């Protein structure tokens, strides 16, 4: 068991909690199951309250607030006490009393700490704050020594990625098939990917959640994996026969169904420009391999160029950009790049090019950015999940991420595409420890 605690400079109260950061389950947010211990000797006449404030901050505004009174517990609202509350009260003396908070959704992130930001105020951010204080009436003077205030965070975790894990296994095993030497490694890789494919066929893609189990989209989705398992079966048969090279040749056919899955279910973009003094268009197509990426995990960008003009492509630029619009009444909007690649690849006239570019966005190189969105060991702000019909005007800070692939052409705007993606965090007796 692990609980936290903060005392006061005058030592007239203490606040206990079971957690630091409270997860957000989209539909509901975990409650704040606090505990308060008070010494009635000084507070012989007065009372004690506990307050929660969700504010944006000298320019300062609030977004949500709620108050609860410890005693007398005669109007015992939320009378069902959670287990930890009862155990904490019973373990400690008879002067500990319970309280509970429940909150509607809001936005949890902060902004970077640099002089002269891009918004109103300095050292801004949105933070939650548990606070208890002692008095007789709710307007009197506040004695900081006889008070307390804590900070809690509304972290929000990424959904399950079983399908992504299955596809990652499939791709790694296909690679080790391609680099194999003898029959045993080929057999082991094929067995692993067969298991992964069968597992993946059960799961449902994020783009058909509202579609029914018997919808034709689901039928086509399952048909694709049926074909994939058949191709793996053919490759396994050839490998078990004894032919290693033929097994590899049969395994190469999986790239076609991988491409078919990408074009239908993965982020993709395509543009086309045909200049004057030219006859056929220039085509650029990119695609990311996953829709969800974790903080620090590399981000891989496919790129395809089929030039048909008389000009030549000089270099390709791959970048990851942060879009952070401030959902206040001022509706300020801005963006800042995070990661960047500057490969010097060239595309000849009437030629084709293809490569995979992998870049990792993280804060070490971005310490000097002026308005980059931070979490709250801090890292870049996780992408905000979309509103479920809620008003966007009072959300707060909505952060999202996009990826850009731009070509540069000699004898001279350029050509580029966007690929939105999601950057988030993965879902993971008693002694008091300092919070």
């Amino acid at each position, epitope marked *: 068991t692990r609980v936290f605690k903060k005392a006061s400079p005058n030592g007239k109260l203490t606040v206990y909690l079971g957690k630091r950061d409270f997860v957000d389950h989209i539909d509901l947010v975990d409650p704040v199951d606090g505990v308060v211990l008070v010494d009635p000797e000084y507070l012989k006449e007065r009372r004690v309250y506990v307050t929660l404030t969700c504010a944006f901050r000298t320019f300062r505004k609030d977004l949500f607030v709620a108050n609860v009174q410890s005693f007398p517990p005669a109007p015992e609202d939320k009378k069902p006490l959670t287990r930890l509350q009862e155990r904490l009260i019973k373990k400690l003396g008879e002067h500990a009393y319970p309280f509970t908070f429940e909150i509607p959704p809001n936005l949890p992130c902060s902004v970077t700490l640099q002089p002269g930001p891009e918004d109103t105020g300095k050292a801004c951010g949105v933070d939650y704050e548990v606070k208890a204080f002692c008095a007789e009436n709710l307007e009197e003077k506040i004695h900081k020594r006889n008070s307390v205030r804590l900070v809690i965070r509304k972290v929000q975790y990424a959904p399950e990625a079983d399908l992504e894990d299955n596809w990652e296994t499939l791709n790694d095993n296909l690679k080790v098939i391609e680099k194999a030497d003898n029959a045993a490694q080929v057999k082991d890789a094929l067995t692993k990917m067969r*298991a992964a494919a069968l597992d993946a066929q059960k799961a449902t893609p994020p783009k058909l959640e509202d579609k029914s189990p018997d919808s034709p989209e689901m039928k086509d989705f399952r048909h694709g994996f*049926d074909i994939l*398992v058949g191709q793996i079966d053919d490759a396994l048969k050839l490998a078990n026969e004894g032919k290693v090279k033929e097994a590899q040749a049969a395994a190469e056919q999986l790239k076609t169904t991988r491409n078919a899955y990408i074009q239908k279910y993965l982020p993709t973009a395509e543009t086309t420009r045909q200049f004057l003094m030219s006859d056929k268009p220039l085509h650029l197509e990119a695609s990311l391999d996953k829709e969800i990426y974790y903080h620090g995990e590399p981000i891989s960008v496919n790129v395809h160029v089929t030039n048909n003009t008389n000009k030549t492509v000089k270099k390709i630029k791959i970048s990851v950009r942060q879009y952070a619009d401030i959902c206040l009444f001022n509706t300020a909007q801005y963006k800042c790049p995070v990661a960047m690649e500057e490969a010097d690849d060239t595309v000849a006239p009437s030629s084709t090019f293809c490569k995979v570019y992998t870049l990792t966005p993280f804060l070490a190189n971005n310490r000097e950015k002026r308005g980059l969105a931070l979490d709250g060991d801090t890292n870049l702000a996780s992408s905000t999940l979309l509103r479920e019909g809620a008003n966007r005007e009072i959300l707060g800070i909505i952060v999202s991420y996009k990826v850009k692939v731009k070509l540069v052409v000699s004898r001279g705007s350029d050509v580029a595409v966007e690929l939105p993606f999601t950057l988030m965090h993965p879902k993971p007796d008693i002694v008091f420890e300092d919070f």
Partner: antibody
Amino acid sequence: EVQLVESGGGLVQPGGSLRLSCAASGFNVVDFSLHWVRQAPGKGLEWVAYISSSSGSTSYADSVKGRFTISADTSKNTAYLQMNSLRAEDTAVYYCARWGYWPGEPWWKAFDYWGQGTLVTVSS
Amino acid sequence: DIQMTQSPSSLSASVGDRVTITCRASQSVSSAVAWYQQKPGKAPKLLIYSASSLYSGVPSRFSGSRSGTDFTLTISSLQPEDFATYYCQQYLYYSLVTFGQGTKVEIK
């Protein structure tokens, strides 16, 4: 109805040879894959070999990889498992099983219909 | 090859009680596990295919659950005709078929 029948069980000297058949009635063999499962007296099940009869594909257990040979015919609806020199550690009952092909439900109903079993014993 | 182990070698219970048999696989098999029942002197009989689906004809007191590489078969209220040896099996592909060791149920 659907049923599996096998024959050929007998006593053979070590280094001897014996033929086992898996006759199927009520269903054509070419629509299913047939396997051989061996159970020692007092021990668990063990898988021996199989054939497909649609592409001719065969495979064998690592214990009888080089010795046994499996083949089938369509007109007679029978699967034959030739036994070469026997090492006296294979004195066990022998069951025949049926497993359907991949696309759909028949693959998931693995070994839904078995046989009754035959006894092959090796001694001196 | 993929090895599959059964934890309880022998289990004892009376009629009407609850009994559970567990089975673990060394390598991931995506619900490609089946349970069989073998009375002394007869052929094996399939009970649960795909680790959760009850085959036709089998009574409804059987049920199987999968959690990762852990498969459990339960008989809610076993009867005198439920005493036999049960076996685990994986069927990911044709050439990779392995069976677990027996579990025996007796009368306490």
